[PDB]
Amino acid sequence: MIQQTEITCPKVNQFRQLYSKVINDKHDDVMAKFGAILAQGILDAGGHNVTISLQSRTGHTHMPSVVGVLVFTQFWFWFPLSHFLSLAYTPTCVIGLNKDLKMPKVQYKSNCKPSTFAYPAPLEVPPEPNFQLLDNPARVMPAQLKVLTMPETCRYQPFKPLSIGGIIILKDTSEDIEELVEP
Amino acid sequence: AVDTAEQVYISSLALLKMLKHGRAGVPMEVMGLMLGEFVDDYTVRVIDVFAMPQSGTGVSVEAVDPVFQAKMLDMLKQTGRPEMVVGWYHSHPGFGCWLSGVDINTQQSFEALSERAVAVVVDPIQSVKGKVVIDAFRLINANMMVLGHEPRQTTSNLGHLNKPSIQALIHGLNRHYYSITINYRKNELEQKMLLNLHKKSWMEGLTLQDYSEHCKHNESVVKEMLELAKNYNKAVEEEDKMTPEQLAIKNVGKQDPKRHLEEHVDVLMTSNIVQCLAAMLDTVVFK
Amino acid sequence: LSSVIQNLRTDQTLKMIKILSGEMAIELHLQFLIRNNNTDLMILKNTKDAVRNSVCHTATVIANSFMHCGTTSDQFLRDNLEWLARATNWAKFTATASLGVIHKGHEKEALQLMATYLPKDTSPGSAYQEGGGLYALGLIHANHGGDIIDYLLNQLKNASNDIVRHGGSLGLGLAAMGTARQDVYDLLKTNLYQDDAVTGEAAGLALGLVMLGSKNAQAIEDMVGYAQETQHEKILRGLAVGIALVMYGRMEEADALIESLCRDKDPILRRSGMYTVAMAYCGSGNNKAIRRLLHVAV
Amino acid sequence: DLYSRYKKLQQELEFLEVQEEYIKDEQKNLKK
Amino acid sequence: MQIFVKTLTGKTITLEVEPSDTIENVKAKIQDKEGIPPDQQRLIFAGKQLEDGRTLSDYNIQRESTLHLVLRLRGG
Numbered sequence: 001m002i003q004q005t006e007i008t009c010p011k012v013n014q015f016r017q018l019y020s021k022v023i024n025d026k027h028d029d030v031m032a033k034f035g036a037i038l039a040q041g042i043l044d045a046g047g048h049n050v051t052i053s054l055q056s057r058t059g060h061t062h063m064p065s066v067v068g069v070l071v072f073t074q075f076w077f078w079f080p081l082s083h084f085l086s087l088a089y090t091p092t093c094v095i096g097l098n099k100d101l102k103m104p105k106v107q108y109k110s111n112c113k114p115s116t117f118a119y120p121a122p123l124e125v126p127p128e129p130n131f132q133l134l135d136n137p138a139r140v141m142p143a144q145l146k147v148l149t150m151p152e153t154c155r156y157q158p159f160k161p162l163s164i165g166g167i168i169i170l171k172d173t174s175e176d177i178e179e180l181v182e183p
Numbered sequence: 184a185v186d187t188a189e190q191v192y193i194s195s196l197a198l199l200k201m202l203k204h205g206r207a208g209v210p211m212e213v214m215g216l217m218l219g220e221f222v223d224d225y226t227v228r229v230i231d232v233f234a235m236p237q238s239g240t241g242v243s244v245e246a247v248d249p250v251f252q253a254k255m256l257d258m259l260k261q262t263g264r265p266e267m268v269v270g271w272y273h274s275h276p277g278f279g280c281w282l283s284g285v286d287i288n289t290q291q292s293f294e295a296l297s298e299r300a301v302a303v304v305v306d307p308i309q310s311v312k313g314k315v316v317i318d319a320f321r322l323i324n325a326n327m328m329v330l331g332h333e334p335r336q337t338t339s340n341l342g343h344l345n346k347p348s349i350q351a352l353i354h355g356l357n358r359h360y361y362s363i364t365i366n367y368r369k370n371e372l373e374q375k376m377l378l379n380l381h382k383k384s385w386m387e388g389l390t391l392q393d394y395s396e397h398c399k400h401n402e403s404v405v406k407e408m409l410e411l412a413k414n415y416n417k418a419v420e421e422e423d424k425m426t427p428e429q430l431a432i433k434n435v436g437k438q439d440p441k442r443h444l445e446e447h448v449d450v451l452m453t454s455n456i457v458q459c460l461a462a463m464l465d466t467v468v469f470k
Numbered sequence: 471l472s473s474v475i476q477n478l479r480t481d482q483t484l485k486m487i488k489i490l491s492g493e494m495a496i497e498l499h500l501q502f503l504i505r506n507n508n509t510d511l512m513i514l515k516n517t518k519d520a521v522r523n524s525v526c527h528t529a530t531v532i533a534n535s536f537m538h539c540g541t542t543s544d545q546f547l548r549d550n551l552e553w554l555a556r557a558t559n560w561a562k563f564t565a566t567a568s569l570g571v572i573h574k575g576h577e578k579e580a581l582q583l584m585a586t587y588l589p590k591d592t593s594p595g596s597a598y599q600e601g602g603g604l605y606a607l608g609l610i611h612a613n614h615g616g617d618i619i620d621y622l623l624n625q626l627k628n629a630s631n632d633i634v635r636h637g638g639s640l641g642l643g644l645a646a647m648g649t650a651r652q653d654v655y656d657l658l659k660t661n662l663y664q665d666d667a668v669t670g671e672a673a674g675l676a677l678g679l680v681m682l683g684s685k686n687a688q689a690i691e692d693m694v695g696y697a698q699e700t701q702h703e704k705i706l707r708g709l710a711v712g713i714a715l716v717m718y719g720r721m722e723e724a725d726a727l728i729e730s731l732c733r734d735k736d737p738i739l740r741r742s743g744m745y746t747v748a749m750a751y752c753g754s755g756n757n758k759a760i761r762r763l764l765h766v767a768v
Numbered sequence: 769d770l771y772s773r774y775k776k777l778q779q780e781l782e783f784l785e786v787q788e789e790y791i792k793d794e795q796k797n798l799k800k
Numbered sequence: 801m802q803i804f805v806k807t808l809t810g811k812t813i814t815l816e817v818e819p820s821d822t823i824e825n826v827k828a829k830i831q832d833k834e835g836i837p838p839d840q841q842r843l844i845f846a847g848k849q850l851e852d853g854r855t856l857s858d859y860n861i862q863r864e865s866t867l868h869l870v871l872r873l874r875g876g
């Protein structure tokens with residue numbers, strides 16, 4: 001379960017309370033709760049912005065993501081080896097950079113056959129749309145890469161067909177481009 | 184400083200000295216010194232173990248003149264190889280394994296004189312069926328009782344190598360001492376030849392079972408499965424024709440299923456198919 | 471990529487160099503993570519207060535580093551520094567290691583940030599501070615050569631303690647991961663032949679890192695020629711991964727080596743042959759391999 | 769869709785001939 | 801004079817005693833330098849047991865003499 005919502009599988013909320021049960025119990029082991037506190041950081045890794053995958057964009061396989069996970073399997077013998085899992089963290093961006101600095105804010109939408117999901121809200125408890133416009137540095141779930149749609153009402157259409165999350169360019173055909181901003 | 188990844192490396196001929204010296208004096212608590220080597224900070228080996236003479240009773244054990252120890256270690260330098268001592272042992276035949284009153288006093292003397300001095304407890308009258316309850320323990324200082332005692336989790340292999348039972352955690356665990364993990368240093372030209380001499384044979388395969396008692400044994404096997412077949416006839420067919428519950432007292436406390444009637448057939452084949460074929464070779468081989 | 475950028479130079483020329491080495495691809499990736507952020511503070515507060523005086527500070531500083539990887543935001547090193555300074559002797563090692571995981575990728579900014587913590591001036595009697603420090607610099611500058619390999623190579627020429635020889639070496643092997651530089655290969659050979667029983671896990675991992683997917687004729691023979699006469703077990707577990715990590719996807723060119731380690735009766739070396747046949751077979755439906763793997767599994 | 773299915777029927781056949789093998793092999797060692 | 805108390809643990813303990821001293825003084829010095837009571841110390845000189853009722857000059861113990869420290873061995 002990584003960057004998944006309730007509509008993907010209902011067992012997510014069953015496990016988050018399963019994690020909180022075994023970490024807020026006193027009559028457990030350190031070894032039992034060590035897997036729970038590690039599962040807190042994996043499930044919310046990178047602020048729901050990265051993901052782990054042994055598979056690349058174009059059918060190829062990643063060398064460091066395999067290296068990053070097999071040395072992570074050696075966490076029995078040396079606890080600082082678990083830092084090496086961060087080599088397998090891969091982004092979920094669709095940033096449409098066309099020139100080496102030109103980052104326009106193109107508002108592209110999606111089309112979901114169900115209602116909204118995809119970036120839930122943090123909880124603190126001590127006529128719906130389906131065409132949600134997103135900017136270019138915006139996250140996207142890897143399971144909704146085919147249900148997005150480029151803005152046909154805008155002239156600005158990309159060169160490569162945006163069907164899978166990664167990096168593309170924008171074929172600019174108009175004049176007087178604007179909207180550059182960098183923090 | 185202290186780790187939770189220590190493994191004592193006892194040799195095979197060390198442990199055979201331990202059980203033989205422990206079975207020699209059973210009601211009088213034998214007592215000896217453990218000789219090994221500290222190869223690094225937190226792995227310690229022990230290969231050869233000698234013994235000391237005792238004069239103790241069945242609940243405590245004293246020592247002898249200390250002119251015996253230093254004269255022993257002086258003579259072990261010129262023959263074989265020299266080492267410095269790494270601990271000691273005893274036998275606790277009555278109860279299990281925990282460190283008694285004078286056992287913690289001699290532990291404080293050795294960890295101050297020597298470096299760390301792991302102590303080993305042996306029950307000689309427990310290692311009977313197939314398993315041994317030998318364990319090694321190690322004193323912790325009383326000053327560090329507001330912080331970790333065997334702290335600093337480096338690995339995660341320290342949890343399934345030892346699980347202290349209820350009889351262990353009542354005496355000193357874990358506020359007085361702690362336990363330590365034991366593996367066995369097994370290698371070649373010692374282990375393979377250990378089985379190349381114990382469970383071996385030459386003529387045992389090609390030897391008859393001396394039919395004066397072989398076919399006499401098969402009489403008392405056919406007759407008892409005869410009676411189990413008398414028992415089997417009524418049992419299943421009456422149970423199925425009266426009530427089809429696939430359940431109670433014929434399920435909860437029974438013993439006559441189809442597990443009992445073929446294992447007598449299983450014994451009767453292996454005892455005879457081998458015995459038939461063993462008498463076939465010597466007809467060809469021995470003219 | 472290092473080959474094709476060499477065959478290219480055999481402006482629009484300078485534009486196509488930078489996109490084939492990768493500088494902006496980290497920057498837009500860094501910009502994507504510094505803009506977007508969804509990390510809940512309350513859960514980490516609900517896990518912090520449920521910790522007694524046990525060893526779980528290492529379990530928490532590995533928890534936040536996973537969820538703040540690339541976020542480049544320090545707030546647990548800012549609100550309760552006294553809570554971080556409670557546990558010791560590897561918790562200080564893991565915490566300064568966790569600081570590099572949070573700053574996952576700067577290539578200049580985290581260097582000058584950790585240029586504050588020099589490896590001779592933080593503390594003379596705390597090697598775990600600089601040990602996890604140099605371990606963290608290798609985590610940040612992963613797969614990006616240049617001065618940083620040579621800058622870490624000169625530090626291991628003048629290392630003080632053997633704890634510092636860990637995080638220097640794991641950082642140096644990670645920064646040269648897949649380069650097969652002869653200079654770092656000579657330093658890690660003679661590091662392995664130091665006959666030290668604590669940097670053997672450090673030398674065994676990083677030697678497979680710099681020789682990743684190389685199939686050397688002599689590295690495999692030297693490492694299995696070293697892991698027979700030794701008498702420690704951490705030296706055997708470090709070289710267990712390193713003889714597996716040297717080969718990656720050869721698909722028939724380790725079948726003598728896979729058979730050579732499984733025929734031996736060293737339990738670590740049998741275990742290491744199972745990792746090597748895993749790494750030589752990636753994404754393949756080799757029916758003979760899974761025949762052989764499950765026969766020795768049972 | 770007459771050739772893409774035909775290789776998939778082989779891979780389901782070849783995996784299943786492996787999956788019948790080691791479970792049949794495991795039953796020998798599980799008796800031990 | 802300076803003596804070399806060669807213990808059985810591979811550690812030589814150097815002491816500053818006088819030829820007119822006894823064994824109880826050496827035991828007290830060892831206890832002050834470490835933490836072993838006098839009743840749990842057995843000094844052996846060339847395979848001979850030293851008694852607390854005599855001095856160092858009775859056993860011909862001169863400057864720089866090899867000793868042997870044996871602790872009280874007792875289990876229960």
Ligand SMILES: [Zn+2]
Nearest residue numbers: 273286875876
């Ligand atoms: Zn005892």
